[PDB]
Design a protein around this motif. Structure first.
Motif, PDB file in Angstrom:
ATOM      1  N   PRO A 132       3.805   1.633   4.217  1.00  0.00           N
ATOM      2  CA  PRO A 132       4.688   2.070   5.531  1.00  0.00           C
ATOM      3  C   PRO A 132       3.757   3.337   6.170  1.00  0.00           C
ATOM      4  O   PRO A 132       3.039   3.857   5.720  1.00  0.00           O
ATOM      5  CB  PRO A 132       5.743   2.863   4.689  1.00  0.00           C
ATOM      6  N   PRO A 133       4.260   3.661   7.285  1.00  0.00           N
ATOM      7  CA  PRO A 133       3.769   4.867   8.161  1.00  0.00           C
ATOM      8  C   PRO A 133       3.991   6.018   6.916  1.00  0.00           C
ATOM      9  O   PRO A 133       5.079   6.193   6.338  1.00  0.00           O
ATOM     10  CB  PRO A 133       4.852   4.883   9.148  1.00  0.00           C
TER      11      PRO A 133
ATOM     12  N   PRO B  85      -3.284   1.889   2.775  1.00  0.00           N
ATOM     13  CA  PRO B  85      -2.540   2.752   3.209  1.00  0.00           C
ATOM     14  C   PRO B  85      -1.733   2.398   4.451  1.00  0.00           C
ATOM     15  O   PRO B  85      -2.497   1.753   5.356  1.00  0.00           O
ATOM     16  CB  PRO B  85      -3.526   4.026   3.452  1.00  0.00           C
ATOM     17  N   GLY B  86      -0.695   2.856   4.658  1.00  0.00           N
ATOM     18  CA  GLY B  86       0.007   2.622   6.069  1.00  0.00           C
ATOM     19  C   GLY B  86      -0.637   3.219   7.140  1.00  0.00           C
ATOM     20  O   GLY B  86      -1.527   4.257   7.031  1.00  0.00           O
TER      21      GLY B  86
ATOM     22  N   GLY C 101       0.639  -1.372   0.077  1.00  0.00           N
ATOM     23  CA  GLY C 101      -0.033   0.109   0.026  1.00  0.00           C
ATOM     24  C   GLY C 101       0.979   1.177  -0.095  1.00  0.00           C
ATOM     25  O   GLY C 101       1.769   1.262   0.158  1.00  0.00           O
ATOM     26  N   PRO C 102      -0.010   2.307  -0.239  1.00  0.00           N
ATOM     27  CA  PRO C 102       1.043   3.619  -0.247  1.00  0.00           C
ATOM     28  C   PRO C 102       1.043   3.991   1.197  1.00  0.00           C
ATOM     29  O   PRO C 102       0.720   3.407   2.355  1.00  0.00           O
ATOM     30  CB  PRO C 102      -0.010   4.577  -0.582  1.00  0.00           C
ATOM     31  N   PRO C 103       2.228   5.104   1.515  1.00  0.00           N
ATOM     32  CA  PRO C 103       2.382   5.420   2.756  1.00  0.00           C
ATOM     33  C   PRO C 103       1.028   5.921   3.417  1.00  0.00           C
ATOM     34  O   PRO C 103       0.116   6.529   2.821  1.00  0.00           O
ATOM     35  CB  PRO C 103       3.308   6.555   2.565  1.00  0.00           C
ATOM     36  N   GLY C 104       0.917   6.061   4.801  1.00  0.00           N
ATOM     37  CA  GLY C 104      -0.263   6.514   5.241  1.00  0.00           C
ATOM     38  C   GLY C 104      -0.222   7.874   5.299  1.00  0.00           C
ATOM     39  O   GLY C 104       0.390   8.666   4.828  1.00  0.00           O
TER      40      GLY C 104
END
Lengths: 24, 24, 24
Positions: free
Chosen positions: C5-6, B6-7, A4-7
């Motif tokens: 990732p975060p 998403p993270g 997934g994408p970064p948060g």
């Protein structure tokens, strides 16, 4: 699937500390 | 495959700039 | 896919409060 994408970004940081004392 | 979710949220932001000097 | 990732770090915070008065 791919990772997934970064948060979402983190929250706004805290306010800075109080400023210096004023002059005499 | 579907992308992952998403993270987690990012880190809290850094503390702000120090405040201005006080009044005389 | 795996969770992402975060996120990015949060924005730096607001300016701190104005400092204390100087001596009279």
């Amino acid at each position: 699937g791919p990772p997934g994408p970064p948060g979402p970004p983190g929250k706004l940081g805290p306010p800075g500390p109080p400023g210096p004392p004023g002059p005499p």
